[PDB]
């Protein structure tokens, strides 16, 4: 206790995160609303933001796969955590206008 | 430090308001994540080395 500050014991803790191909199991405290389909809505699936139209899908996800990508290399298929299904994300109607 | 422990935590909700009042002063340095938004994420596996 009479040592200098550059000698006193310091407790150190290191937290290492893992974002792997599996349902996260350390999700933070937040509520969960119901599920709505065939309507351009916002969403938050396991902390992943985005707006789109959740539609029923038919692609056969592998047993341990969690997310999915497209030929354009972006998120388009999501497996719902509470109820294990496969949902497709597609932007709602959109286009240019002319007068 | 020569035989540092490792603790694995899984299958639990993690509220981080606990670790805000643990000492009068401490260093909280995060690489890749900001502490304020850290509550609103979903890490898959988190390991603690003490």
């Amino acid at each position, epitope marked *: 206790p009479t040592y200098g500050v550059g000698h006193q014991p310091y407790r150190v803790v290191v937290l290492s995160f893992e974002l792997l191909h599996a349902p996260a199991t350390v999700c933070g405290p937040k509520k969960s609303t119901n599920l709505v389909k065939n309507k351009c809505v916002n969403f938050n699936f396991n902390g992943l933001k985005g707006t789109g139209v959740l539609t029923e899908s038919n692609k056969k996800f592998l047993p341990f796969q969690q997310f999915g990508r497209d030929i354009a290399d972006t998120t388009d298929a999501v497996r719902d955590p509470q109820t294990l299904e496969i949902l497709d994300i597609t932007p709602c109607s959109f286009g240019g206008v002319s007068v | 430090v020569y035989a540092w422990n490792r603790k694995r935590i899984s299958n639990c909700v993690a509220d981080y308001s606990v670790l805000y009042n643990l000492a009068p*002063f401490f260093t909280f340095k995060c690489y890749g994540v900001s502490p304020t938004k850290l509550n609103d994420l979903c890490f898959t596996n988190v390991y603690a080395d003490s």
Partner: nanobody, 124 residues
Framework: SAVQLQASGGGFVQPGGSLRLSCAASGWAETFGHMGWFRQAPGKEREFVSAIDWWDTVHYYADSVKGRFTISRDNSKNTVYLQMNSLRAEDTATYYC????????????????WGQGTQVTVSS
């Protein structure tokens, strides 16, 4: 980061005397950085006086107060202390303890946080 600085000390003194100032820090910051004191004369600009690393290894002092002001650190209270003597009339000013949140100090221009002004007055 969220750091709160509590300052203590100050008052009215006689020229050439000694007085008492101390600053404590609380909260959480990015790293263990430097800590210093800043002087504001009435009607003048705010200038630094000194800067001490957290681990009390290297000290930096201004040319105008070298050999007359010193700063040290507690060993069981996490509160920085400073001592002075031979106070002159120009020392009547407002002092603020400031925390610099980087490991290695380069210059006093970028200041992170500021404390409540402690006014010290010296006269006959």
């Amino acid at each position: 980061s969220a750091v709160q600085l509590q300052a203590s000390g100050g008052g009215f003194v006689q020229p050439g005397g000694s007085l008492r100032l101390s600053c404590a820090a609380s909260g959480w910051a990015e790293t263990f950085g430097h800590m210093g004191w800043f002087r504001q004369a009435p009607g003048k600009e705010r200038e630094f006086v000194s800067a001490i690393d957290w681990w009390d290894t290297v000290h930096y002092y201004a040319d105008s107060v070298k050999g007359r002001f010193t700063i040290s650190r507690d060993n069981s209270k996490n509160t920085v202390y400073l001592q002075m003597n031979s106070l002159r009339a120009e020392d009547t000013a407002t002092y603020y303890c400031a925390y610099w949140d980087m490991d290695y100090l380069q210059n006093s221009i970028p200041v992170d946080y500021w404390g409540q002004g402690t006014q010290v007055t010296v006269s006959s």
